[PDB]
Amino acid sequence: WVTFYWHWKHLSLWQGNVAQFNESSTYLMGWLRDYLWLNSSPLINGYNPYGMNSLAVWSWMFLFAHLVWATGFMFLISWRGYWQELIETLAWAHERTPLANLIRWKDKPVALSIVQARLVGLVHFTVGYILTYAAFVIASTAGKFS
Amino acid sequence: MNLKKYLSTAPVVATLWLFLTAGILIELNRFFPDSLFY
Amino acid sequence: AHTVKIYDNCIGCTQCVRACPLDVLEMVPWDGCKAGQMASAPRTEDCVGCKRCETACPTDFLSIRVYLGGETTRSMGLAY
Amino acid sequence: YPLNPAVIFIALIGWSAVAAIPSNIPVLGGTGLTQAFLASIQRLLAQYPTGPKLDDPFWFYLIVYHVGLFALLIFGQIGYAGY
Amino acid sequence: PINSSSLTRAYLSQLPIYRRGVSPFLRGLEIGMAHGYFLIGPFVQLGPLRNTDIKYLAGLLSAIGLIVILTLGMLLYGAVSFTNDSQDLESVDGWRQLASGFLLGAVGGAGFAYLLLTL
Amino acid sequence: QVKVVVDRDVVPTSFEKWAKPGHFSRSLAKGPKTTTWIWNLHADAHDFDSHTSSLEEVSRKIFSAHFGQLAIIFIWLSGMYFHGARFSNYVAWLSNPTGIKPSAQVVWPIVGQQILNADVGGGMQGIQITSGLFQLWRASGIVNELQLYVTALGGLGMAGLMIFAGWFHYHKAAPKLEWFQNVESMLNHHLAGLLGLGSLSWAGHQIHVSLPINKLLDAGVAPSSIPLPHEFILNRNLMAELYPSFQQGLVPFFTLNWKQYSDILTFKGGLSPVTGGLWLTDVAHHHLAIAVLFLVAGHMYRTNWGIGHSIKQILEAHKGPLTGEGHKGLYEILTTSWHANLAINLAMLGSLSIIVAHHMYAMPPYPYLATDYPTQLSLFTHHMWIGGFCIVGAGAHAAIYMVRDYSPTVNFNNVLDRMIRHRDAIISHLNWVCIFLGMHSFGLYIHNDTMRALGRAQDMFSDTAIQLQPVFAQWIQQIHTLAPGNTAVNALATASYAFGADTVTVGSKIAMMPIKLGTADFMVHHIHAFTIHVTTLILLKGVLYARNSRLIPDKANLGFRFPCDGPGRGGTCQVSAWDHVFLGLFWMYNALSIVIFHFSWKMQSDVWGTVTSNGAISHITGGNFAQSAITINGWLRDFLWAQASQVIQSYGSSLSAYGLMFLGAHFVWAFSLMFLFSGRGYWQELIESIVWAHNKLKVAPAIAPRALSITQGRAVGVAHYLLGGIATTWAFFLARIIAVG
Amino acid sequence: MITIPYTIPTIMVISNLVGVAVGRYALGRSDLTQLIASMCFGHIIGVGIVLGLSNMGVI
Amino acid sequence: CAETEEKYAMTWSSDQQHIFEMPTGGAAVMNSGDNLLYLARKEQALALATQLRTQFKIQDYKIYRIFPSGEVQYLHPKDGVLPYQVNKGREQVGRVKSTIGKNVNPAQVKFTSKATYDR
C-alpha cells in the first residue's frame, strides 16, 4: 500500500492530472480502475499477436511472477500429510516399475517438513509479489513515458 | 412455554435485534436521507 | 530420536499408553501418586512423535512432553 | 487368467456377415455396412496419403466397424465363460 | 501379481540390462544404440534450426548435447551410489563402463540417425 | 417382500427440545464450556449418521429433512413465479423479447440504490434477470400475470404440503427401516412414477398448452388475441386449425397410425429461426420418448409379483475373473449406508448438471434464449458450478463411507476393496496422468507465451505456427454435420448448429454459430482433461486413502474430520479424507473457472455477437480467440483485462452493484487467505491476549472464547475462497454481457 | 384396424402369443402375472414390430 | 525393501476364521489356527493390534522385528503383560524431578550441549 500509493500519486503528478488522483483515489475502484486497470495497459501490451516491443521482458516477468505467487499458495494452503502420503505412491511406483528400480535413491524421498513448507510458500509469495510489482512499476512508468 | 426460550437463544435474539437496529437505520434513512451533518 | 520425557504430574491414568499407537510408553509402578502408577518411555527409538499422547494427557499441563529430536528411519515413519 | 484363448476369426464372420447382406440404403452405404468399407479400403490401400476428415466411407466405417468388432471379440471371450 | 506373467518376465528378461552376461561397455553400447538413435528425432522436426539446411546437424549437436549431460548423470549416480566393487553394473567400474558405453553407443546412434536421414 | 410398516406418533412435537441447543448429540449436550461448542453445534447438526448408530432413527430424520429441502425449493419457485407476477416486466417482455431486457427485481428506493433499477424497457425498470425465467415461461406458455400469481400460490401450497409432509413423517407417522430398504420399489417408482409420469404429463402440458401458444407467438400474435391454454382443450377446433392432426383424435394413436401425429410430434432438431429456440414439436415428442422409455425402464425390479429383478441377483452374476468375487456385497453396501448413495447420487447429479450446461449453450431449448446472451451465458455457468460442487460431495461421501460405514466383513474380495489392494497403482497413474497433462496442457502455454515474447512467433502453437488441430473433435463434429441425411435418417436439420450448417440469426442476434475448433481449443481441452484429472486424483486419493493409508494406518479410528495426526512422521498436517475434499474444492474452483473462461471467451469470439445486412458477421470480441488463447498474455490481456472494461467502468450506471460485487468478492477471496495460511495456534493466544483485556474489565465471556478448530479454520478458508472467487466471476460475467447482450 | 385379412391386429396377436410363450419360459408359473406381464411384453414387441414394419417397408 | 529395511512380522493366533482389515488396505482371510504377517512399519502393526484387540480376544500376539541382518526382536507385549496394565518389572526411564516450571531457560543451555529440561 505504501508503494501503490506513492506510485499512483506520482503517476498523477508526472502525468500532470493531480485531479485524476484526488477525484479517483478516495474509493477502491479508483485504485483498481484508475491505477491497476489503466496503467497495466502498456504493460500487458508487452507482446501481442501483432508483434512485441521492449516491454516484452516485463510483461513476461509479470506473468511469470504470478506463476511464482500462486505456487506459493500450494505450499501455504495445502500442508504436508497430503504429500507425505503421495510421495509414498510415487516411491511405490518407482520401486515397482522395471527399468527404473535399478536407479534407486540414496536420500529417501520425503515431503517437505511443515516449517520448510510454510517457508518455501512464503518465499514464492515474496518472489511472486515483488517480481510482479517490480514488473508493474517499471513497465507502467516505462510505458507511459520513455 | 419453551417457545420463548427458543426465542431467547443467541441467533434468534441477534436477528430480532439486528433486524430491529437495521430497521432503525433503514427507516431512519428513508425519512432523513443524505444525513452528513450532525 | 524424539525424546519423550514424563514429568511428575503423571498421575497414572494410562490414557497415554492407551493413546500411543507405538508402545513406546508403558506404565511403571511408582509409589508417588494415588494410583501408584507413572508412565515410562523406554523405547523412544520407535517414537514417531505424533504427540497423540499429549492430546490424551489429562494432567494440569502435560506431564508427558514429546521433544522433537532426531529423525531416524523409524522415527520418520516412512513405509518403504 | 486367460484360460481359453482359442479362436478369434469366428468373430470376423460373426461381424462381417451380420452386416454385409443388410443394405439399409439411404445411409452412407447404399450397399451393406461392410461392403461400403471393404470396397472403400482398396482404393486407399496401395500407399495413398489421401483420406482426409471428409472421407466418410473410410473413417466412419473405421469406428462403426471396429466398435462392433471389438465388442463381439470381447463377447467372444465371454464365449469362454461357459467353460 | 498381474503384469508379472511369463510374457512380461520373458520380455523384461532379455532387455539390455536384465540379460545374463554382456561386457558393461557393450551393455551400455546397446542402451546408447537405442537412445542415441532415438534422440535425433525430436530435434530435427521440431528444433529451432528446423528450417535451414541445419535441420539435421542441429539434431547431432543438440542430441549429443543431451547425451554428454546424460552420461554426466550416469557418472554422478555411479559416483554416489554403487559404492561396492562387485564388477557388475552395481559397481563403480561396471557402471562407468555402462556410462562410457552409453556415450560411445549414443553418439554412434546420433551419427547413425544423421547419416540415415540422408535418404 | 414389500409392505408398508410405519410407526405412528413417534416423536412429540413440543418446543421443549428447542430450548436445549445441542439436544441431538450426547457428545454435545454438555453445554458450552468453550465457543467451539457453538460451531460444533452446526457441523454436527446434520451428522445424521453420527447421532445414533440406529439406522431407523437416522433414516426417519433424513427422509423427513428432504421435505424441508423441497419446502425451501417450493418457497423459492413460488418466489420466482410471484416476482414474475408482481414485480416483473414479463407481460411487456412477451411483446418484443429481443428489445426488452428481462427484469423482475425492482430495488427499493433508499440512498443511491435506486440507480440499480435498470431501465430495461417495458415501461418499468429494475435490476435485470439473467436467470432466464422468462424464456422458461414463454416455453411454458404462460400468457398473462394471472398464471404467475396462481402458480406462485400453488408453489406456496406445495410448500405447505412439504412442511406438513416432513412434519408428518418425522413425528406422527414415520416409517420403519423395512420401508426404506425397499429399493426395487424405490427405483420402480422413481424410474416410472417420478421421471416417467413427469415427462409424460409434461408432454401433455407441452402439447395442450405450449404447442398452440408457441405457435401463436411464433406467428407473432400479441398476448391478448391468444386464448387461454385452457381454451384449447374445451374444443379441438382451436387446435385443429393450428394442427389438423388433433381432428383425428386419439384414433390414430390406438390404431398405431402414428404417421398422423407428424404435426404435433416430429424429429427435426436444429433451431426455429423465428424464436431462436428448439421446436416444441421436437421437445414434446422428446418427452414422449422419455415417457415411454422411462415407464418401460421402471418395470425391471421385482417387488411383490415375481416379475422383475432384484439388485442382488444382478450384482452377484457379474463375477468376472479379474475381480474374483464380482459385485457380491454392493447391495448390502448401498442399502445400509446413506453416504455411499449420496456419493453416487451427487456424482451423477453433478455430472448431469454439467451435461445440462453444455446442452443449454449448444441446443438452446427455450424461445429467445440465445438472443439475450446473459441468460444464455449464466444458465451455462450456474449449472456448471453446482455441476462442480456436487462432484466433490461424491469425493466427500465416498470418503465418509470408507471411514464411517465401511465394513470389511461384508466387503471381502469384491470389486470394491480389490481396488484398495492396488490403490497405489490407482493414485500413481493418476499422478502420472496429472503430470503428463500438466506439462502438455500448460507447458504449451508457457511455450507459446515465451515464443510470442521471444518474437519467434513461427515457433508457437498457433494456426500459422506448429498447428495442433484437434483431429478427433473436428472429425466427429463433421459426422454431426452429416447427421440429418445419412444416419439420423428421419431428421431434417442437425442435432445442433454448434456442429453443422450456417448460423441462426434471430433479430440481428446470433443464436448459434458452427463452432470451429482449431489448435487453441485443443489446448484448452487439455486444460480441462488436466484439471479434471487433478480433482480425480485428490478425490480418489481421498477415498482410497480414506481409511488406512501407509502413512497413517488408522484413519478409521481417528475419524473423518480429524485435522492431522501431529508433527510425527515429519508432520502429518491435512491428511484426513476430509482434507482431500478441502483440496478438491480449490481445484473445483480452478477446473470450473477455466471451463467457464473457456466458454465465455470462445463464445464471444466464435458464436455470439450481432449481424448486419448481406449476412455479414460481427462477434463481440471479433474473432479474437485462436490468435490469443494460445498464450497467457493473450489470455490475461485479451480476456481478463479487456472484458473488465464493462465491469470496471460501471459506476454511476445500473451495473454498478456488480462493480460492488466485483471488488468485495475480491475482498472475501483474499479474506479467505487469512484462514488458509495461518493457524489456530497463533489465533488462540492472540485471542487469549485479548481475553486479558476483558478479564481486566470484568467483561470475561462465560462461554470461553477459543479460536476456531483446525478443520473449521480451514473449512472457512475454502468457504470464503469459493464465495469470493466465484462471486468475482459472477459479477464479471453478468456485468460484462448485460452491457452488450 | 380392419378385420381378419392381413392388417395391424393380425401382427399383434402373434407377438402376444410369442410373448406369452416367453412367459412360459421366463419363470413359467401359470399365474395372472404371466399374462399381465408377458402379454405386456409381447405387446411391446408387437408395437415395436408394427411401426417398424410400417416405416421401412410395406406393412 | 527386504534387502535393506526392517520388515515387521506380526505373529498371532485365533480361534475362528474371522475377517480383519489389513493396514495395507482391504480385507484379509485370517487363517484360524496361527498366522504371521510381514509388515512395513510399527504403527501399521500396532494399528493392527488395536484393529484386532478392540474387536475381540486376539491375545498372545507379537511382531518379531525382522531386521535385514536376520534376527528378531519382541515388540508390543515385551513382558507377557499388556503395556497399560502394570507389571512390577518395567524400570522407569524418562522422568525429571518436577514439572516444566523448574526447567532451565535456554540461555543457560546456550553454547552447551545440554537440554532445556536436564537438571
Ligand code: CLA
Ligand atoms: C511441456 C510442454 C512443452 C512442449 C511439448 C514443448 C515443445 C517444444 N518446445 Mg518448449 N517450453 C516449454 C514447454 C514445452 N515445450 C516450457 C514450459 C518452456 C519454458 C520454461 C519452454 C521453452 C522453450 C524454448 C525456449 C524453446 C522451446 C522449443 C520447443 C520445441 C522443440 C524442443 C525440443 O527439442 O523438444 C525436446 C524433445 C525431446 C528431448 C524428446 C522428449 C519427448 C519424447 C517425444 C517423449 C517420448 C516418450 C515416448 C512416447 C514413450 C513411449 C515409447 C516407449 C514405450 C518405447 C518443441 C515444440 C524450442 C523451439 O524453437 O521451438 C520450435 C525453443 O527454442 N521451448
Ligand code: CLA
Ligand atoms: C410413484 C410415486 C412416487 C413419486 C412421484 C415420488 C417422488 C419423490 N420421491 Mg419417492 N418414494 C416412492 C414413490 C414415489 N416418490 C416410494 C414407493 C418409496 C418407497 C420405496 C419412495 C421413497 C423415497 C425416499 C426415501 C425419498 C423419496 C424422495 C422423493 C422426491 C425426490 C425429489 C424430487 O424429485 O423433487 C421433485 C418433486 C416433486 C415432483 C414433487 C412431487 C410431490 C407430489 C405431491 C407427488 C408425491 C406423491 C406422494 C408419494 C403421495 C403420498 C401418498 C400418501 C398420501 C398416501 C420426489 C418427490 C426423496 C425426497 O426428497 O423425499 C421427499 C427421498 O429421500 N422417495
Ligand code: CLA
Ligand atoms: C500456479 C500455481 C500452481 C502450480 C503451477 C501447480 C502445479 C501443480 N500442482 Mg498444484 N496447487 C496449487 C497451485 C499450483 N499447483 C494450489 C494453490 C493448491 C491449493 C489447493 C494446489 C494443490 C495441489 C494438489 C492437492 C495437487 C497439486 C498437484 C500439482 C501438479 C500437477 C501436475 C502437473 O501439472 O505437472 C505439470 C507441471 C506444471 C504444469 C508446472 C509448470 C511446469 C512447466 C510446464 C515445465 C517446467 C518449467 C521449467 C522447464 C523448469 C526447469 C527450469 C528451472 C529448473 C530453472 C502441478 C505441479 C498434484 C500433485 O502434486 O501431483 C500430481 C496434486 O495432487 N496441486
Ligand code: CLA
Ligand atoms: C424421437 C424422439 C425424440 C425426439 C424428437 C427428441 C428431440 C430432442 N432431444 Mg432427445 N432423446 C430421445 C428421443 C427424442 N429426442 C431419447 C429416446 C433419448 C434417450 C436416449 C434422448 C436423449 C436426449 C438428450 C440426452 C438430449 C436430447 C435433446 C433433444 C433436443 C435437441 C434437438 C435435437 O436435434 O435432438 C435430436 C435428438 C436426438 C438425436 C436423440 C436421439 C435419441 C435416440 C432416439 C435414442 C434411441 C435409443 C435406442 C434404445 C437405441 C440406442 C442405440 C442408439 C444410440 C444407436 C430435441 C428436442 C437434448 C436437449 O435436451 O435439448 C436441449 C439433450 O441434451 N435428447
Ligand SMILES: CC1=C(/C=C/C(C)=C/C=C/C(C)=C/C=C/C=C(C)/C=C/C=C(C)/C=C/C2=C(C)CCCC2(C)C)C(C)(C)CCC1
Ligand atoms: C511404437 C512401437 C514400438 C516402439 C518402437 C521402437 C522399439 C523403436 C525403436 C527403435 C530404435 C531405437 C532403433 C535403434 C536403431 C539402431 C540400430 C538398429 C543400430 C544401429 C547401429 C548403431 C547405432 C551404430 C552406431 C555406431 C556408429 C554409427 C559408428 C561407430 C560407433 C557405433 C558402432 C556405436 C514397438 C515396436 C515396441 C511396438 C509397436 C509400436
Ligand SMILES: CC1=C(C/C=C(\C)CCC[C@H](C)CCC[C@H](C)CCCC(C)C)C(=O)c2ccccc2C1=O
Ligand atoms: C508440492 C508440494 C510438495 C512436493 C515438493 C517436492 C517434494 C519437492 C520437489 C522439488 C525438488 C527440489 C525437486 C528435486 C530436484 C532437485 C534438483 C534435486 C536436488 C535439490 C537439493 C540438492 C536442494 C511438498 O513436499 C509439500 C510438503 C509440505 C506441504 C506442501 C507441499 C507441496 O505443496
Ligand SMILES: CC1=C(C/C=C(\C)CCC[C@H](C)CCC[C@H](C)CCCC(C)C)C(=O)c2ccccc2C1=O
Ligand atoms: C481469524 C482467525 C480465527 C479467529 C476467528 C474468530 C474466533 C471468529 C470471529 C467471528 C465470530 C463469529 C465473532 C463472534 C461475534 C458473535 C457473533 C457476537 C457478535 C454480535 C452480533 C454479530 C450477533 C481463527 O479462530 C482461526 C483458526 C484457525 C485458522 C485460522 C483462524 C483465523 O484466521
Ligand code: SF4
Ligand atoms: S500422564 Fe496424563 S496420560 Fe500419562 S498417565 Fe498420568 S494421566 Fe494418564
Ligand code: SF4
Ligand atoms: S510421541 Fe507420538 S508416539 Fe511416542 S507416545 Fe507421544 S504420541 Fe504416541
